[PDB]
Amino acid sequence: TAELKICRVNRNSGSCLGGDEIFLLCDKVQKEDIEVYFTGPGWEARGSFSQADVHRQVAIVFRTPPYADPSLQAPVRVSMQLRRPSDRELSEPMEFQYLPD
Amino acid sequence: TAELKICRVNRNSGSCLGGDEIFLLCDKVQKEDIEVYFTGPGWEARGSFSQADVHRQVAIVFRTPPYADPSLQAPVRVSMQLRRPSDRELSEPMEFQYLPDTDDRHR
């Protein structure tokens, strides 16, 4: 039922230390059944936010998670995706790059 | 405050030269009847965006207008509000701080 779609973001790169605030505009989602996933080879972490951070079901403001390597020497590419935990549905991925701090 | 309301923004400060991208979350608005109104003593300006920049009536991504003075030496706080042209309704004001900036091409 329904699909997940990332429409726009304020940024697609951030520090490998995590903690950057991201504004993500999306198609209708359910605040109690939604997450933001970051994935790379041998690594996965969720964006940090609460239900109050989901605005009118069409935008999520969250903080990026720390990357697996806190002392990056060059950019690394990971995928950012919306994920509905109930049915495991995933949105098409968006490129996100973690950078040296 | 009645119906127009700014709920959250990605940043509340930017260059006095304008052009900074702002993500503003708000209560329901009509894309063809809404604007972001900046004001200060004897100065007014509007944020720049297209109707396509209004996301599902509850979010606006816009570029800040340039402040009245590009020679700003110290930060200056101004007001930022949602404004509805049709009935001139205004949201409660949010503070925005313009910051000094330079352009090697402008003297």
Side-chain angles (χ1 to χ4, degrees), chain A, chain B residues 1-103 105-107:
Chain A
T1 303
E3 70 170 61
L4 308 168
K5 176 180 175 178
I6 295 176
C7 298
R8 203 212 295 235
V9 297
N10 63 314
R11 70 193 289 177
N12 51 21
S13 76
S15 175
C16 59
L17 296 185
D20 291 313
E21 190 170 71
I22 309 291
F23 274 62
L24 187 163
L25 308 187
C26 55
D27 276 356
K28 175 183 179 181
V29 296
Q30 296 288 63
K31 61 184 181 181
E32 54 287 78
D33 190 18
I34 193 68
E35 287 172 337
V36 178
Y37 258 61
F38 288 80
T39 310
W43 181 75
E44 97 168 9
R46 290 175 292 182
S48 181
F49 67 101
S50 66
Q51 299 195 186
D53 296 315
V54 181
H55 183 72
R56 310 299 179 283
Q57 301 175 299
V58 298
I60 306 180
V61 179
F62 66 92
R63 295 277 176 168
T64 58
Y67 179 56
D69 185 350
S71 59
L72 231 47
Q73 293 301 294
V76 298
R77 185 208 291 214
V78 298
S79 294
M80 178 170 56
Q81 288 170 292
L82 281 173
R83 174 173 179 287
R84 180 159 50 198
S86 63
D87 69 331
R88 305 277 226 58
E89 188 68 3
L90 291 176
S91 75
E92 198 165 303
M94 178 181 277
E95 174 181 7
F96 182 89
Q97 295 183 191
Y98 272 106
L99 316 165
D101 188 66
Chain B
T1 178
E3 43 202 300
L4 282 56
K5 173 187 182 185
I6 298 172
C7 303
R8 195 210 290 237
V9 296
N10 64 316
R11 73 150 89 197
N12 55 186
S13 72
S15 169
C16 60
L17 297 175
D20 292 314
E21 185 173 68
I22 305 299
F23 275 63
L24 182 163
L25 308 186
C26 53
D27 276 357
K28 182 179 176 180
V29 298
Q30 304 291 53
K31 64 182 183 300
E32 48 287 278
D33 187 35
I34 194 68
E35 38 177 51
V36 186
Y37 188 54
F38 289 74
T39 59
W43 173 74
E44 35 183 39
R46 295 172 167 59
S48 169
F49 62 104
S50 73
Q51 280 182 37
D53 289 315
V54 183
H55 184 74
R56 307 296 184 289
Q57 305 187 69
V58 299
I60 303 174
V61 180
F62 68 93
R63 290 285 170 166
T64 60
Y67 179 56
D69 176 31
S71 71
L72 194 61
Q73 293 294 58
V76 60
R77 301 180 181 185
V78 300
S79 297
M80 189 181 87
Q81 295 163 296
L82 287 170
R83 178 173 184 284
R84 183 164 57 207
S86 67
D87 68 356
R88 292 199 256 62
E89 184 60 52
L90 291 164
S91 73
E92 294 191 305
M94 176 179 267
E95 193 172 70
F96 186 88
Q97 178 185 60
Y98 276 115
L99 314 166
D101 197 0
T102 180
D103 185 353
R105 295 180 301 171
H106 191 340
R107 293 185 169 186

